[PDB]
Fold this sequence. Notes:
The first copy, chain A, is mainly beta. Chain A has strands spanning 25-29, 35-40.
Amino acid sequence: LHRSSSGWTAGAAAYYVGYLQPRTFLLKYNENGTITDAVDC
Amino acid sequence: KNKCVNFNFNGLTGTGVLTESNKKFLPFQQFGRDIADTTDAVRDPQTL
Amino acid sequence: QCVNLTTRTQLPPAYTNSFTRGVYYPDKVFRSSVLH
């Protein structure tokens, strides 16, 4: 927070919260090891 | 190097011959395997 | 410590669709040109 104890204010941002599941993915590795694309079964 | 030795990792056991390589691992990865689950290249923990 | 703020605005819990996000490395195994 910022203030130019309850007169404070925030800035300008955003954040989202998701949920995980025990799924199965596919890993496509290149010559350097960076994941280029994944497949959700 | 270049001899049939018995490497002893903290989480990997097995024998093999250590030699030079042309690959380049990621700075956080330490293991490397083949297609059918065969470890053939590991990173040295002392020297990068 | 226990004083609540006065600039709080109630928002409905809406949804946002992801396309291909959420993929990480499950282990430290280096491979190349495979699909496991």
